[model samples]
Target: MTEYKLVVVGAGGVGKSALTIQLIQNHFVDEYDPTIEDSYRKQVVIDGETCLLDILDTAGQEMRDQYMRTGEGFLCVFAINNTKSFEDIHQYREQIKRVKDSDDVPMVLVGNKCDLAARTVESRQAQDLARSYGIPYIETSAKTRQGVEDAFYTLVREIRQH
Candidate 1:
């Protein structure tokens, strides 16, 4: 099986850990604790192919440029309810391209916490931004498991293609 390293990145409390934890454990956490970094490994099937996924759930407090240099793929996460977090995804994209020395690095722009009704950023806006970068934009709710697997799978598929 192919092994891939994926990094989760975004501003604090943007649900990066929540989405990673939900995908690995099938559990939702209501509380938020700032994470420096956490790693997870699991075997998953995407497009009928099985592979080992190494996930790095990173904290917003650190510079992720170095992480981008090492990761095979990335999940650029943001909260739909937080406009600033949504804006930061662009910065993450730039950092990844600069560090990886390629603009075509595998990535997915993830809008997390879609369960919230009080959203500051609309889905269309995110989609447009992602399209400009030639990456997929996915909306996910860790609490409801909506589009969570799809987000990871999308990035993994991109990594495989690259």
Candidate 2:
């Protein structure tokens, strides 16, 4: 099977793991622990298209060599309710710079947890943030299974095309 590394980069508590689970297992939940360090390696086949997806679930803000060694692009995730992450789009930008050996690398901005609008910190902020970075953007809610699969597959489709 064709293989690709999909790094889910974000600060802690942003549902990186949840998104991963949602895409792979088609399940979603309300609760997650950011303190947990984890990774999921799985294969996906869509319409007879098969690929092995190596997912890196990172913690904190640092993008180490682990993100680079995978030799693939990223699905940069942030929480919609967390203004701090929304403001610091550079965190994702810088991480991509460090991980990618070249200027051209695929990336997608996934704003997670849209299920909780009342606790949300900002609206439409990520759209401009993503436009500035020149990446595709989508708001996802793992709790309600909204935009979860499309987020990952979109990046994967882009990678396959380019």
Candidate 3:
């Protein structure tokens, strides 16, 4: 129950912590910080099975492989409006693969801040990127409080697939 490690790796300011905190806290935003520092836990009923999801929000920090090595699954988040953040996603995946020592791992490419009007990455383009690796791509808008759960739940399911 304490071993289902679902980690998050993304650039800072990419809403990496923002989305998971919403999933953990569920629309409670009065204390919204620009970044979430500590890890989190949430008991969820995923696919009718009770699951304890452990999350480590190690977004854009040094010594990240220490966290990545333990990630049962990863949510690679990027701001839809930030091209640099989107580019970081590629590097993050490379690191995860190296840490896991394999090309296969449970991960989802997340394009957060979908609520924003301006954008640097297109939805079709992002999806096509994921399709190459057979990974799922999810869009979430924590500001609007949408699609947060599905992305989290999806990662848990991905871990179960292994």
Candidate 4:
């Protein structure tokens, strides 16, 4: 069995949970699940490919570094409506650099909630960031189920190729 694990990390209200939900359960939400207290883990497969996705849906600055420590590869998600989410990516980048044991673990940049087109970080800018960090970038909308599953599989596929 070929198994791979990925970690999703982001600040609160950045849509990390929604992306995880959409990816694992193929579902979306208009509001956050208040009943849920902490991060959750899920497993999912698509096109006969399976992955063990560990979502470290952290609250804020505190949980970021801890999850980065254990995560091999990461899907760094940021909300389009919040410019700060995009701006704050450098912190995650640096954390990954410090803790990642291998030079080859992939980081996939996810611009979450692209359904709200009016409030998006420019694609060109995001691409530039990805290029600078040597990571992959994609605009995804969990609410609309856009680019949700592909976000994870694309990263997995890159791992497969090399």
Candidate 5:
């Protein structure tokens, strides 16, 4: 099987864990437990290609350059309801570039927690930011299971191309 390493990064309480669990378990988790550092592996087939997904869910409190360098792709996530989390993607992107020393790395800009839209950051705003970086933008709700799989699949497809 094809294999890839993906790292998920975002601010604290931004639903990285929820997204990861939903993608791997096909279910939503209702509690918030700050991740220390955890790795999840699953076998999946995307677009006729069977592949192993190795996802590293890092603690949002810090972004480690080591992980950025080691990972083949990235999911830079943020909660739609949290503007600070949305704004922090800039830092995450910069760190990834600094470590990988490339601006063309495979990555997706994810806006999580779309189920609670009353406080959501506008999709257009997020999309515009993603466009500036030449990456796809996805909105996902761990509660509703929207766009979660698409986000991962998009990244995997991008990685395969490069």
Candidate 6:
């Protein structure tokens, strides 16, 4: 009967909004507005328990820490094709910890656009980073809707575990 506040954060154009849209609509669109920081609510059953997820899809890592304090969990996202986005992924993880004022926080490192080729962020590297963070790493293709639900579900599970 608990509700989770899941925030998707990352560098600009890394498909944070796209990933959220895929989860919400089960549909994909190449064109998206990165500026729309809309809140979404969805209901689902996880681990045989009915739960509500409140998603806040921000444009990027452009959010204020005070505003992010309420995030129960996070999907720290990056685009597979962009090296800059991948390198910038760590900032959000550390920022979340600072804002939450805890060494431990529920977070999932997400790589979007897995369906596209010319990838710059390697899968092995992502796994290593997630392991270092002691969290889960999920590769997703917002365009194909692959790993979309799993990414969000994994974050919810992290929150539940903590």
Off by over 4 Å in 2: 61-63, 119-123
What are the per-residue Cα lDDT tens digits for candidate 1 across 1-162?
Answer: 888999998888999999999999999998959998789999988888888999999999745667768999999999999999988887888888889999799999999999999988999999999999998999999999999999998898898889
Which is superior by TM-score, 3 or 4? 3
Runs with alpha carbons beyond 4 Å of true place in candidate 4? 33-51, 61-63, 101-104
Cα lDDT of model 5 by residue, 1-162, tens digit: 788999999899999999999989988889858998999999988888888999999998854988889999999999989999999999999999999999789999999988894775899999999999999999999889999889999999899888
Which lDDT tens digits does candidate 4 get at residues 1-162?
A: 455656776666888778777766767877855322355566667567665655555554444556667765688888878888898888877777777755556779999888895785788898898898777899899889899878988877766765
Pairs of residues clashing in candidate 1: none
Error of 6 at 33 (Å): 1.2
Task: Estimate the lDDT of model 5.
Answer: 0.91
**TM-score for model 3?**
0.92
Tell how far residue 51 is off in model 6, in angstroms: 1.3
Candidate 6: tens digits of C-alpha lDDT, residues 11-95? 9998887788778887776785665578889988888989888998877735558557999998898998999898888887888
Q: What is the lDDT of residue 61 in candidate 3?
A: 51
* TM-score, one value per model: 0.96, 0.86, 0.92, 0.82, 0.96, 0.94
User: Which stretch of 10 consecutive residues in model 1 shows the poorest summed lDDT?
Assistant: 60-69
Candidate 1 local accuracy as lDDT? 0.90
Candidate rank order under TM-score: 5, 1, 6, 3, 2, 4
Candidate numbers, best lDDT first, in rank order: 5, 1, 6, 3, 2, 4
TM-score of 2: 0.86
How many residue pairs clash in all the candidates, one count each? 0, 0, 0, 0, 0, 0
Model 3: per-residue Cα lDDT over 1-162, one tens digit each: 445898888887778777877887766354535543568877767767877888888746545878789889999999999999888788989989999998989999999999989998999989999999789999998877778988988888888887
Off by over 4 Å in 3: 28-37
Q: Which residue pairs come into collision in candidate 6?
A: none
Clashing pairs in 5: none
Strongest candidate by TM-score: 5
